[PDB]
């Protein structure tokens, strides 16, 4: 996240960090949505993925910090692109659930749709400048803006895309490399999943793309329920 500051150590209990057994590099984030499920982006998947919950600093462990591996991964059945990245979302079932604690708590899915003008918060362990990756997650506020700002920048993201276009039109604040999968929080709810954006991050008139969670609410709840034939919104 560029243009922001260190997040408050207690404001992101639902935030999880994704890495692998092969490296300590955090390549994405995700959000805990209940004791045994994590919501993130499909492109964050790795064959040997590891998930850190209850973490702030990558090096200084919180007393209740936990490590988990998946017992299952779920993607949209029906997608336009062969790689499914037109519906960049995935659910990870934790091998063992976590116990809610001071630094570990679920975030709510959207209770209603939020659009243009809504102020939201982004957060992650992604790049904070063209040269630096942080050790603690950084946060900042952005706005959902008209989808038109994104359409010309990302040809692969149509006006009919189940995505939210968001950022600061002035430039300066934006998610960045390594922030994918993390939550776009609006009014205490997870309205988006960081997908992608422009290069470099934070440019004037170049908001980024976040998977619009509200649309997948039924799919998400059905997978959690145990359904395995349900499909994502068309």
């Amino acid at each position: 996240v560029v243009g922001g500051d260190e997040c408050n150590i207690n404001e992101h209990p639902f935030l999880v960090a994704l890495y692998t057994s092969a490296s300590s590099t955090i390549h994405c984030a995700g959000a805990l949505i209940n004791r045994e499920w994590v919501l993130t982006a499909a492109h964050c998947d790795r064959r040997n993925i590891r998930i850190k919950l209850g973490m702030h600093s990558k090096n200084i462990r919180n007393e209740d910090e936990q490590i988990r591996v998946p017992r299952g991964k779920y993607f949209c059945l029906n997608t336009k692109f062969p790689n499914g990245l037109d519906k960049d979302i995935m659910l990870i079932r934790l091998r063992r659930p976590v116990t809610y604690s001071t630094h570990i708590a679920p975030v709510s899915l959207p209770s209603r749709s939020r659009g243009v003008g809504s102020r939201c918060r982004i957060m992650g362990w992604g790049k904070i400048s063209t040269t630096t990756y942080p050790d603690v997650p950084h946060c900042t506020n952005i706005f959902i803006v008209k989808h038109k700002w994104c359409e010309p920048l990302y040809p692969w993201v149509p006006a009919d895309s189940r995505t939210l276009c968001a950022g600061i039109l002035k430039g300066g604040r934006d998610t960045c490399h390594g922030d994918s999968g993390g939550p776009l929080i609006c009014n205490g709810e997870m309205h988006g999943i960081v997908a992608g954006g422009s290069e470099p991050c934070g440019q004037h008139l170049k908001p980024a793309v976040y998977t619009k969670v509200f649309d997948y609410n039924n799919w998400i709840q059905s997978i959690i329920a145990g359904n395995r034939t349900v499909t994502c919104p068309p």
């Binding site: 692969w156 960045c176 490399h177 994918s180 960081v194 992608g196 954006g197 422009s198």
Partner: peptide, 7 residues
């Protein structure tokens, strides 16, 4: 999808 897009 452009190579610089996914974060």
């Amino acid at each position: 999808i452009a190579a610089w897009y996914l974060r």
